[PDB]
Amino acid sequence: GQLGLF
Amino acid sequence: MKFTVEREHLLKPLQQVSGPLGGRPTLPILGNLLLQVADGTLSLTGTDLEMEMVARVALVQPHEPGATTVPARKFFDICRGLPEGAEIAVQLEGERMLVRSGRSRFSLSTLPAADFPNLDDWQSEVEFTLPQATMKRLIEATQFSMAHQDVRYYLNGMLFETEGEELRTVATDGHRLAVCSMPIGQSLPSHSVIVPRKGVIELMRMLDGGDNPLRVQIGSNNIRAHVGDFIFTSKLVDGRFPDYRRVLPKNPDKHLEAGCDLLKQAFARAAILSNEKFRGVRLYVSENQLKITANNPEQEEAEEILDVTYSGAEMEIGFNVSYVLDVLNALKCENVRMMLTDSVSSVQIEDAASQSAAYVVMPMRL
Amino acid sequence: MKFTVEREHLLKPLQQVSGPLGGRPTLPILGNLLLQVADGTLSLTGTDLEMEMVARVALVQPHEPGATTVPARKFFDICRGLPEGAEIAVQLEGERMLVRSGRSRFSLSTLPAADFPNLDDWQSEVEFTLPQATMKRLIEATQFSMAHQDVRYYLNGMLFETEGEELRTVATDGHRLAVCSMPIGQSLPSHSVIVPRKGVIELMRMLDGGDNPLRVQIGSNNIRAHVGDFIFTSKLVDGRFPDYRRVLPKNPDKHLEAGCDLLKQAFARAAILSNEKFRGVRLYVSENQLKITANNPEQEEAEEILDVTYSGAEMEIGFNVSYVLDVLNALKCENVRMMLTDSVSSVQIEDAASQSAAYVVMPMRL
């Protein structure tokens, strides 16, 4: 799924 | 309080000041506009407690000083509903305000001007003037990346930073980020503040694309912008906004360049067959070629092949196609550059012929 | 099944047949378009069970007969998303339909053509041809008076009645009624049917504004309209519509004439200060004058005065300003005639220069 920048 | 003025001289001011009003939200008073006559000037003020929009109109006809508040929507609709070139005479009659034009009469209910919400006085610490178009470019280039109703409310706004001879805006929702900077020819102190989502919109809407410059004033807890005869002021959001310098990919060795429009249209068609929930599309990069694929639960499949400039190693990487399209839509340039690292690292996108704006998007896992 | 057709030859048909669909089909296959290739023609059909829209597209390129159904919106979006001048090659391959254009490929899920609804056969009982302009006039003149989600289902539609050489439409929600009749140069049998709201909107959408004749066929339970290469069919509403002849005010001797725009603008302004629920306004008619007043709970008041032509007797009558506005907004004429009888009677409104359309509004109890 979607990953996070921070 | 008394004043007579042309309909067309009230329309834009009324439209602008009614901007901060979210209909009939909080207190009843917030659905009203503050009317004030002082000197040969009529001032109109709309507010939502968080921000305020003030319009000043020159009174060339006889007038009497005073203040009151009236229902914004109704007063505006009345003025707009009257014929073009209409003279509008307004006079306060105790608890109601009488509006007259031709043989049309209207009595509006009021609320004490003394009870109208007003932002406490504050002091600016930074001041500068810049073209309206520049402020417009800054906001448009990053607005789409602000979070909406995120717990970390400080993300639900836009960062405005003064650094060197430039003004910069930053927006991110944790998945994608946008940063843009423009020079204003003025030496500026280093300052960073977060403007609430609604303030950004109001500021944007306040630009008439005119030539008249924009005067910006920033304080520790407020921001103010003067355009023509309008003055916008908003509180700021508290909290540490992420540092874009720490989000920009550190080693985007692989560089792909492609025509922005063919790229956008390909992603747009592929998105049709992407999962409606997660919007994932797959990018396959090979020598001078990009293959975009999409599939959904029912196993439909979209495939797009485009010629691009790329000499790096082959790799596959997934992305939420909407985040990608938002970026390509904001760039509106001729060619774009995509700088990648690997399938689990964010990608930085930007105009191939300009680094004034940069976009970072975290890939999807699959 | 296979065919290849230029993009611009498919867009119009696709848009038209997707008319009955609404983003939320009630049955899965209703969200699909039936595609059939036979005798050098490609037929596309969209349906929502209550009505269908069929488009015939000539195939001047190699093709193979057959049929299947595919997602309407997805197919339409793929086609319009392709570049202008694109050749769209389509071929059925079992459970999927492949769409190719340039280096763009799409595989769509299908549903058996055998499962596509078609409305079991019916017989035309009344037929006539009329100018598209006449149908547009008949619908626009009355559409607004149809009921919105009324338990008496037959009021949510529009009555189409043939009498003598005239085709007439009637619409009513119980409070107000609209009726319009136009000669169609044919001697027709006395007949009437009720077309569902959805069907009325579809008939209007299919009018292209040209000289193509409109062929209408009416059955015991269906209506069909043919324009150019499009065929629309809808189920009729099983009801017992009211008789407009019996609702028309019984001889309203007091005739008031006024400019439609001035009258509309005066009503529009007064409505601003009317009850946001009952929307009531009051009319005071006297020698060549009309005074429209309005007030709400907040104790706000609006007053409009205008010169009109009136020689009758003085009276005060109340009306729902929206009903009055709907009529004046439908009339696109210079002057309007209002025919009143008394304060407890309904009023009949007409273009002062045309009796082709009549409107009846029940007054509001004072």
Spatial contact of B44 and B35, defined as CB atoms under 8 Å apart: yes
Find where tokens 């946008």 sit. Answer: B178
CA B245 vs CA B239, B250, B339: distances in Å = 18, 9, 16
* Crossing angle between the packed helical segments C321-330 and C260-271, to the nearest 10 degrees: 150
Number of H helices, E strands in chain A: 0, 0
Neighbours of chain C (3+ CB pairs under 8 A): B
Nearest to A3 among B172, B242, B364 (CB): B364
Q: Are B17 and B33 in contact (CB under 8 A)?
A: yes
**Residues B155, B173: contact at Cβ < 8 Å?**
yes
B267-B138-B173 Cα angle (round to 5): 60
Longest dimension (CA), chain B: 78
Tokens 């089909």, residue located: C25
Task: Supply C246's token pair.
Answer: 């019996």
DSSP 8-class letter at A5? -
CA neighbor of C338 nearest in space, from C274, C247, C260: C260
Residue numbers of C between 151 and 210 with CB closer than 8 Å to B:
none
CB B270 within 8 A of CB B88: no
Chain C residue numbers touching B78 (CB-CB < 8 A) = 269, 272, 302
Residue C77 contacts B where some CB pair is shorter than 8 Å: yes
Nearest Cα to Cα of residue C345 among C328, C325, C365, C359:
C365
- Partners of A6 on chain B (C-beta within 8 Å) are 174, 242, 246-247
Strand order in the sheet with C335-340: C158-172, C176-195, C354-361, C347-351, C335-340, C254-259
CA-nearest residue of chain A to B344? A3
Reported resolution, Å:
1.9
Instruction: Check residue B185 and give left, alpha or beta (phi > 0: left; psi -120 to 50: alpha).
Output: left
Q: How many CB atoms are closer than 10 A to CB B332? A: 12
- Tokens (6 digits) for B311: 């000499």
Contact B361, B176 (CB under 8 A): yes
Give the nearest chain B residue to C96 (CA atoms).
B300
- Compute chain C's Rg from CA coordinates: 25
Phi first, then psi: give them for residue B323, nearest 5 degrees. -65, -35
| Phi, psi (deg, nearest 5) at residue C248 | -60, 130
B281, B293 contact by CB (below 8 A): yes
What is the C-alpha separation between B357 and B365, in angstroms, rounded? 26
Output the CA angle C32-C35-C37, nearest 5 degrees.
175
Sign of the Cα torsion C106, C112, C115, C117 reads: positive
In the three-class reduction of DSSP (H, G, I as helix; E, B as strand; rest coil), residue A6 is classed as coil
Determine the Cα–Cα distance for residues B235 and B128; give it in Å rounded to an integer: 18
End-to-end CA distance of chain B: 67
Report the structure determination method: X-ray
Taken as a whole, chain A contains a residue count of: 6
Closest partner residue to A2 (CB to CB) among B242, B247, B362 is B362
Structural domains in chain B plus CATH codes: 1-123 (3.10.150.10), 124-247 (3.10.150.10), 248-366 (3.10.150.10)
Q: How far apart are CA C245 and CA C334, in angstroms?
A: 26
Q: How far out from the chain centre does Cα C116 lie?
A: 26
The Cα B154–Cα B147 span in angstroms is: 9
Q: C225 with C232: CB under 8 angstroms? A: yes
Question: Do C and A make contact, counting contact as 3+ CB pairs within 8 angstroms?
Answer: no
SS3 of chain B: CEEEEECHHHHHHHHHHCCCCCCCCCCHHHHEEEEEEECCEEEEEEECCCEEEEEEEECCCCEECEEEEEEHHHHHHHHHHCCCCCEEEEEEECCEEEEEECCEEEEEECECHHHCCCCCCCCCCEEEEECHHHHHHHHHCCHHHCCCCCCCHHHCEEEEEEEEEEEEEEEECCCEEEEEEEEEEEEEEEEEEEEEHHHHHHHHHCCCCCCCCEEEEECCCEEEEEECCEEEEEECECCCCCCHHHHCCCCCCEEEEEEHHHHHHHHHHHHCCCCCCCCEEEEEEECCEEEEEEECCCCCEEEEEEECECCCCCEEEEEEHHHHHHHHHHHCCCEEEEEECCCCCCEEEEECCCCCEEEEECCECC
Cβ–Cβ < 8 Å for B358, B344 = no
Contacts of C155 (CB under 8 A, 6+ apart): C146, C147, C172, C173, C174, C239
- What lies within 8 Å, CB to CB, of B111 at 6+ separation is B28, B29, B32, B68, B69
